């Protein structure tokens, strides 16, 4: 009951896939937090480096994501996975080494020449971080989509359970890793942090390599695969155009459309929301409690998605999730026109034309945070159902290109969001931004609604079977 069953469970493809994904996410999040903190620190606190980093990441993701989706769709599986892993890990190690070495020779190198090498070093850091992010995106899409779909086989409940477990692991890692890495940073020296990051990434490289080989050996169905200067610049353009037009012509175009539209928002736990809360003076312990509540509601959303998909269906699950999120956003919107809200149209939203950076009632904030948390539960359910739809309804010979164009679209809608944060950074004009975000959410769900009407007709409200 314990000696044999546990040993059998710990030697299955599912568990090894879970372990590999958890290690990869842990390493990625730790690296991301370390890079953010270090770039905030060694360079003076300013929006220039942050804006450059965000813009570079977004644009690279769009273009090279279409390209790498095409590349993944035309090679073997073990080769692509191993390649992605090695590239990402080596990028991270080298980047961290260079970072620490500059942290060392900072003043001497600044005095050297006319300071023209600091810019080169920043360029190198940005480029290598971008390369690592691209490799991480590639490995994420290939592993999750292709390998999860193949391993799950023919059962549909297994696919749902696998997706839910992946989401839970992602949420727990996202909550936990930054806290631990910040603790180890503040309890020591930057040498401790950088050495820890590099060593952890190296060991993770080795272990994940072995785990991927073992999973490939265990499942024999992964080996088979159905379907198997002017020109050097023209070929990428042809692949880009073909991928985008193929994505546009898919019958599930509107679902991915709505999911992408759901990405531009300020109603999420993020640097902007935390800054607004600090402006309102909500301390740090309360912020930690709110993050814990957010994680709990995300887990609850995954559980609800599993139950609903088992009970009602796939499309109706998306409808229910959309309705829930919309109601919670309405609750959040109510907060703006309430006492204690610093909003007025008299002050122009645009104040930094060319400069930039280069008591009170408490009901409003409480209502806002309740709204965002319940929105989080609904959004997680909707994300899971759309992901399963995309996994289930795409030809194998094109699972890479379609998912890559999806990622590009998602990042685009992210980029626009960042832009508006630059345009209206005033704490007063925050409320208006909220409205815009809610509006966008509505549009997405409306668009998803049309998809439902194209696949269910007038029988839009019947969860059970006919009687």
């Amino acid at each position: 009951g314990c000696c044999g069953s546990l040993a059998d469970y710990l030697t299955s493809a599912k568990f090894l896939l879970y372990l590999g994904h958890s290690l990869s996410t842990w390493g990625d999040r730790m690296w991301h937090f370390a890079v953010s903190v270090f770039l905030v620190e060694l360079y003076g606190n300013s929006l220039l480096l942050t804006a450059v980093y965000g813009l570079v990441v977004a644009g690279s993701v769009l273009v090279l994501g279409a390209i790498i989706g095409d590349w993944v769709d035309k090679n073997a599986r073990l080769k692509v996975a191993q390649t992605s892993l090695v590239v990402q890990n080596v990028s991270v190690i080298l980047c961290g080494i260079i970072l620490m070495m500059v942290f060392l020779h900072k003043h001497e190198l600044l005095t050297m020449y006319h300071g023209w090498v600091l810019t080169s070093c920043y360029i190198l850091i940005i480029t290598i971080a971008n390369i690592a992010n691209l490799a991480s995106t590639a490995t994420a899409i290939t592993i999750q989509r292709d390998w999860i779909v193949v391993v799950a086989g023919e059962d549909r409940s297994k696919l749902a359970n696998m997706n839910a477990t992946i989401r839970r692991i992602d949420q727990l890692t996202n909550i936990l890793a930054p806290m631990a890495v910040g603790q180890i940073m503040t309890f020591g020296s930057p040498v401790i942090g950088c050495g820890f990051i590099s060593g952890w990434n190296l060991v993770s490289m080795c272990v994940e390599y072995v785990l991927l080989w073992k999973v490939y050996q265990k499942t024999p169905a992964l080996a088979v695969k159905a379907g198997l200067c002017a020109s050097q610049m023209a070929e990428p353009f042809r692949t880009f155009r073909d991928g985008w037009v193929s994505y546009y012509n898919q019958p599930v175009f509107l679902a991915g459309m709505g999911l992408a539209f759901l990405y531009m928002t300020v109603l999420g736990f993020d640097c902007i929301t935390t800054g607004y809360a600090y402006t309102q003076g909500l301390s740090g312990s309360i912020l930690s409690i709110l993050m814990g509540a957010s994680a709990i509601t995300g887990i609850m959303g995954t559980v609800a998605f599993t139950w609903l998909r088992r009970k009602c269906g796939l499309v109706r699950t998306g409808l229910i999730s959309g309705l829930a999120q919309l109601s919670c956003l309405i609750l959040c919107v109510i907060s703006v026109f309430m006492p204690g809200s610093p909003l007025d149209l008299s002050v122009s939203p645009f104040e930094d034309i060319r400069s930039r950076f280069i008591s009170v009632p408490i009901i409003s904030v409480s209502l806002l945070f309740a709204g965002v948390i319940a929105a989080r539960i609904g959004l997680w359910s909707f994300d899971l159902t759309v992901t399963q739809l995309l996994q289930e309804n795409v030809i194998e010979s094109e699972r890479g290109i379609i998912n890559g164009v999806q990622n590009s679209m998602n990042y685009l809608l992210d980029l626009l969001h960042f832009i508006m944060v630059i345009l209206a950074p005033n704490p007063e004009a925050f409320g208006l931004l909220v409205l815009i975000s809610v509006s966008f959410v509505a549009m997405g769900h409306i668009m998803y609604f049309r998809f439902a009407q194209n696949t269910l007709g007038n029988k839009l409200f019947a969860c059970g079977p006919d009687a």
Partner: antibody
Amino acid sequence: EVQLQQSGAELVRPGALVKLSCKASGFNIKDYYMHWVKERPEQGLEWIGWIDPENGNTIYDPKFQGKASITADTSSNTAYLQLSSLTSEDTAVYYCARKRGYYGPYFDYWGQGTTLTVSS
Amino acid sequence: DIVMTQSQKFMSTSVGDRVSITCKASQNVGTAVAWYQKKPGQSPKLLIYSASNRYSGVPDRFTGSGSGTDFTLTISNMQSEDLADYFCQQYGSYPLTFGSGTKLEIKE
């Protein structure tokens, strides 16, 4: 080896009830959608509807909305099509087909077909 | 709903040459078209899916082409084992619809 079996050679009087069966061997119908298709003599193929055996949801064609019913049995791995108020214009050949998803590209496996005739 | 029509009904061919069957839709379906073959007294069998891809054990003399509203199935070097009916079916949106079909007859 995937196989679909249908009972056939049905002759009925007008205004009655007919039940046709499609039995699957080599796979579980719980993982697929089951579709029914009609073919009338010297006419084209017509789609009737589909069922999901996992939960029992059924989608029909507005032309057959009020005269056809589809049911499934997971334990016996069988699908059933029921027709009511038959008229002489219903004599045809009926096929049971398998589909993968909501927008599956193709019907990989079909049935042998069942001949239904309405006489007097 | 989308009405899917094939112009030619009877196509009289000869052994050894190449033939083309055209299918036209009333809306911009995209690339969601499949071609099936049916012999008399039998059940239809899959030939081409997504207008370009072949299905496993199918002779390489069948080719799918087209996009938008017009699609074409081409047979190179016809063989006596290819005198049957061919249907084009769309799956862009519900309800699903089929084509009328096409006959093949030899020359005399």
